[PDB]
From a paper:
The core component of this machine is the envelope-associated needle complex, which consists of a multiring base, an inner rod, and a needle filament extension that protrudes several nanometers from the bacterial surface. Furthermore, four residues at the end of the C-terminal α-helix, three charged (K66, D70, and R80) and one polar uncharged (Q77), form the lumen of the channel and create an electrostatic surface potential of alternating charges, which spiral upwardly about the needle, a feature that has been proposed to be important for substrate translocation.
In contrast, and as previously reported for the cryo-EM structure of isolated filaments, our structure differs from the SSNMR structure of in vitro assembled filaments. Even the closest structure of all 10 SSNMR models reported shows a difference in the twist (63.35° in our model versus 64.00° in the SSNMR model), which although relatively minor, leads to accumulating differences that ultimately results in noticeable variance in subunit packing. Consequently, the overall fitting of the two structures is poor. To clarify this issue, we solved the cryo-EM structure of in vitro polymerized PrgI needle filaments. These results indicate that the differences between the cryo-EM structures of in vivo assembled filaments and the SSNMR structure of in vitro assembled needle filaments is due to differences in the experimental approaches utilized to solve the different structures rather than differences resulting from the assembly mechanisms.
Numbering used by the authors:
A (entry chain K), B (entry chain E), C (entry chain J), D (entry chain P), E (entry chain D), F (entry chain I), ...: 3 to 80
Write the structure that this text describes.
Amino acid sequence: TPWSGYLDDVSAKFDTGVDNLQTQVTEALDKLAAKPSDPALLAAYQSKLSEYNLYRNAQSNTVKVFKDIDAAIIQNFR
Amino acid sequence: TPWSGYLDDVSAKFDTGVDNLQTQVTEALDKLAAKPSDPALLAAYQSKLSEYNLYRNAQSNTVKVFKDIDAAIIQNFR
Amino acid sequence: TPWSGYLDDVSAKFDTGVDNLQTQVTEALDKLAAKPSDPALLAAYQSKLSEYNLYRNAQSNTVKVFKDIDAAIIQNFR
Amino acid sequence: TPWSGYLDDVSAKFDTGVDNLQTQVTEALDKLAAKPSDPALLAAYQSKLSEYNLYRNAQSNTVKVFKDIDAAIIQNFR
Amino acid sequence: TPWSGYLDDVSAKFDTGVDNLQTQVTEALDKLAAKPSDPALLAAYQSKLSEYNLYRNAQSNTVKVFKDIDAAIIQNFR
Amino acid sequence: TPWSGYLDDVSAKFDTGVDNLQTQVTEALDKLAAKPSDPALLAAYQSKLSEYNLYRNAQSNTVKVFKDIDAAIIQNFR
Amino acid sequence: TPWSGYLDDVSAKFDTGVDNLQTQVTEALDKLAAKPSDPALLAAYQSKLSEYNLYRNAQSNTVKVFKDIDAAIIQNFR
Amino acid sequence: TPWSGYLDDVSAKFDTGVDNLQTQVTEALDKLAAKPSDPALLAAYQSKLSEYNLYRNAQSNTVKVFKDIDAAIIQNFR
Amino acid sequence: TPWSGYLDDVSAKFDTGVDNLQTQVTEALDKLAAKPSDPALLAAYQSKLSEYNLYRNAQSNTVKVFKDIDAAIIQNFR
Amino acid sequence: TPWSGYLDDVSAKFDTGVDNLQTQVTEALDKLAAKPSDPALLAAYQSKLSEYNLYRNAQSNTVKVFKDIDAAIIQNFR
Amino acid sequence: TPWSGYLDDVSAKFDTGVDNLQTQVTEALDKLAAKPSDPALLAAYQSKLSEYNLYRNAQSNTVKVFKDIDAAIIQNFR
Amino acid sequence: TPWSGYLDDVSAKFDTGVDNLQTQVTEALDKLAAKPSDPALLAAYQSKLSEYNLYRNAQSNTVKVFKDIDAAIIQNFR
Amino acid sequence: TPWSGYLDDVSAKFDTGVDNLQTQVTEALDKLAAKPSDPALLAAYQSKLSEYNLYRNAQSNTVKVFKDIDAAIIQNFR
Amino acid sequence: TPWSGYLDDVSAKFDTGVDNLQTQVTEALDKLAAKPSDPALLAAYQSKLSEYNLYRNAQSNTVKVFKDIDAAIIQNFR
Amino acid sequence: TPWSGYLDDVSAKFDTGVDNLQTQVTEALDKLAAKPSDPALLAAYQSKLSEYNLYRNAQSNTVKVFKDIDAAIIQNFR
Amino acid sequence: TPWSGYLDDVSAKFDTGVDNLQTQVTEALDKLAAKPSDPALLAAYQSKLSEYNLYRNAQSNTVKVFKDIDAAIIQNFR
Amino acid sequence: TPWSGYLDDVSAKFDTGVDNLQTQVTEALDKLAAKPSDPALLAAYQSKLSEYNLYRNAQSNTVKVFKDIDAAIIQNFR
Amino acid sequence: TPWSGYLDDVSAKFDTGVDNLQTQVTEALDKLAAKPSDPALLAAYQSKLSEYNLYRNAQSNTVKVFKDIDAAIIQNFR
């Protein structure tokens, strides 16, 4: 079993919270790259890519805050 | 069950809001391509295609706004 | 009763200040998705969506300022 | 009964002063990780996380001051 | 009473400024569709439709400007 | 008498510098909404609205600079 | 009568120096939360909030300096 | 005296530059509407209307450029 | 073997997704330049060129988004 | 050797694709100007001139599209 | 003699570099407003206005860069 | 005569070094607030405000350094 | 000597490139207005007017392109 | 020998990469200004000008990216 | 067997408490250096590196405190 | 053999992790500068340059973090 | 001979490392201010100004680091 | 042979432990000062300078500790 600290648990709640968004973006890209002119594939890939962008930004900026909550507590040990 | 975020729900409200506009445009194109000289088929395909254009533009520009509402909130985490 | 700090009160003043803007945007989207070609539904949804964008941006950037007012006071404890 | 000194009492006044902020941040993270694109979940998680940051900073910098009040009195015993 | 923000008030000044232009275009269309060969109905419907086009364009581009005035002020909070 | 700090004085110099631009835009909108097809009302409202846009942007970006001049001086107290 | 030391007097000179800035920010927030799209309410709340930020930072960093002037004198008793 | 900014002065240079073109178009329309078959009235109204079209287009596109010169300077304040 | 990062893989999925669209546009141009008056060559070159335009725009705007997803994560390292 | 970019190569494929259409139009004009009443010279010059018109329009509108494909890629560098 | 810092000297090099472009635009506007239908006045005013636009944009964006060169040096004093 | 220490002399060298920059910014603001659409007033106020920002930052960060040079010498008395 | 920027030089290359086309159109109009029934004057005025139309369109659309080349470079200063 | 940094080398690779495109555009303009009605000169000048536009845009946006690669490394020195 | 004092035991509790965080950071760096554009590798390396930073800071500041607890006891021997 | 510390090893893992990205960007620039109008060269250079940007940012921000991990340990020696 | 410490030598290595970049920026500004519409002068001034920005930032942030290396050694004298 | 005490041996273990870091920083500065815009020279100089900073801080804080170990033993002679 690999070790997971608290920032790993905060980061992996977004990983387990979305089910297969990492797959659905790669699947919708492979459908779009086969035919980049279908409106139904562009509108589906816009929605999946614009959610993967907000997924990664929320999952990164949350880890950045809890790292700043912790580093300001460890600063007060000494 | 495939995962659906909030931009998927906003995009699929237009998908479920129109019933079979994705079908009616493809059906009216197949009737028009068989006979591209009937005024009744041209006038019916003009109406269906000009609604599919506004369908896709509204469904795309709405996802683009809610992606900008969200990305300016996630910007304020840190 | 759930706990509410000062940034919750600042954030919920915008929530209680608008009455049902969270509802009126979802209602106007459901009317627009049923018929994305009516000018009266597009002009009503433009106004509601452009107010929900300014609602969320003002409600987020205000919380961000009061969080920076507070964190610069707590910095001066030690 | 576990022993609690004076710095434990100062630290646990913040723990008992907030009711369930340690829970509400973990609950709002679990709601946000399931859907990191809802503006209502981002705006609620911004407020809860920005209060948990000020909670921990005030609860840490207060313990640090009272530890410096005490260590400068114990310095004057000898 | 439904909530109305400032962009709703700017949009509804055009709605209340014209009296029944939303009705007069629908009435003139119903008179024209019954007989699309009368010059008096075509010349009356041209005038009503060409005013409804300028009505919607002015009512939309004004909301778009005041949304850009506001979003550049909210940008300067932080 | 309400209190006015230095950023209030900088903001209200633009308010007192224009005489009744806040009125002239609302007056020209009410004349335009009554008849959104007159070229003389559109050309007068374009000029008033394009000045109100530059009025608010200059009045906001100036307050933002003097707030950054001050916050970098208060940073140097400690 | 509650006791007030010298750092209370330095802190309350800023409290009595501004008249009702603690009120004017809460009043301007309540006007802005009712309508977060009025440029006149955003420009007035920007000025009041950007003064309350400099008010609290100056009132905190001044107390921090006089606490360091005093603690370096009390250090020289022994 | 009503206030006039710089875009008002640029717009009113076209207003004062033509003398009574706003009158001469309305006068030539009233002469043409009384008799829309005189070649001398049609040829005079063609010239006046085709100058009023270029008058309004030049007076509008000039205000639009100077509004873009200014907004790109105010962008560089911050 | 040349190195390929993740943006190379996203860009080359469009390259491998279309088979020989880079060839079919150059072949249809060489057939059209030999005879730019055949309707069958113009209608075939319109379809191929209008797909190569959407191919390059989708393949470029996708790389631009994933470059912005990544640069906002690398921003949060420090 | 003069330099030739990609738009030069696209433009010169039409130049090399037609053999001597730039010559055949000038030759057929010189034969027609010597005798502008021969039906065989008018019918031959109609065909050559109507092909030179479609030659230049296709050769110009193709360069215009590839210039818009490129400028939207260079837009995504930054 | 009025004081001139380095950003004044950078801004006034554009002012002294053009001779009377601030005059030539106002002169060409006064000639165009007297007759907004002369092609020779429109083509001369297009050239003067399109140079005044690039004059102000270059003169503003240069001051903005040297202000950012300086503010990043003054940041390194402390 | 008011007393002036060494940090007063360092701070007032910037005050006497600029002649009337405290006046020229207030004069250029009063000219800009009367007409916030003139490019010549915006470009002059950009230069004056961007110099007043660097004036105050250099005059503050220099006092902050000499206060740290001195406080580390007074630390070595005992 | 009047100042001439680069767009003046591009515009005046067309002015100096044609010799007296501005004169020859005015001369051919004065000959045609004296007798608007001579085929030799109509055929000469058709050729001169149809060249003055292409002269002004090429001289205007070239200035418009070089103004867009420049404004996209000045955009990249900051 | 004049000094050339890395952004000079990136900018001058486009300068040396095209041979005489700066000359060929000025030569094709001088041929077009002498006769702005020849289709062969318009079609040759369209190709040269549309390549000079993409030349300058690529040469500018590349320098802008490498300036942003460098400024984010120099940011990490301190 | 190497000797381990009490500060070694406090330091090695963090070493044995994390399992292979010293390995997982080096493994995630080697995966990221092979492809520094994958969002899944950047988001995984952000979490591992931000935990290794808090690991080392907590493991260092704890040893620093227990070294100060001990040195103030050994000071009281004599 | 040149000396390499730990930050050299962290920096050179990105150097050895990409194979010849420092070469492929310089090769793709030399191909693009020879012809800055080919869509295939622009789309290949966009991908290589957007990966070199993320390469340098990740390789710089990682060295910056490990320098801050180390400097906070060396701070705890004394 | 003026005295030069080690930070003077570090600062003047950038001064002697660039040859005449302080001159080439002032020369390119004087050429650009004479004609702020030439693309060749804008593209040359963009490259020189964007190198002078990185010159001053690297030359300032390096002096700032070596001043922090030294001040942390002089801190350890006592 | 110059005399070397124990603190000289502790200080010179860092001097002999790094091979030519005192040279590699001076060599990388001389390469960077010749061209302060190359990303490869900035990224190499960042790594060398950030190691020279940790080299000097570790080599200074170690001498400071062993000087405090010794001075507390010499204190116990009498």
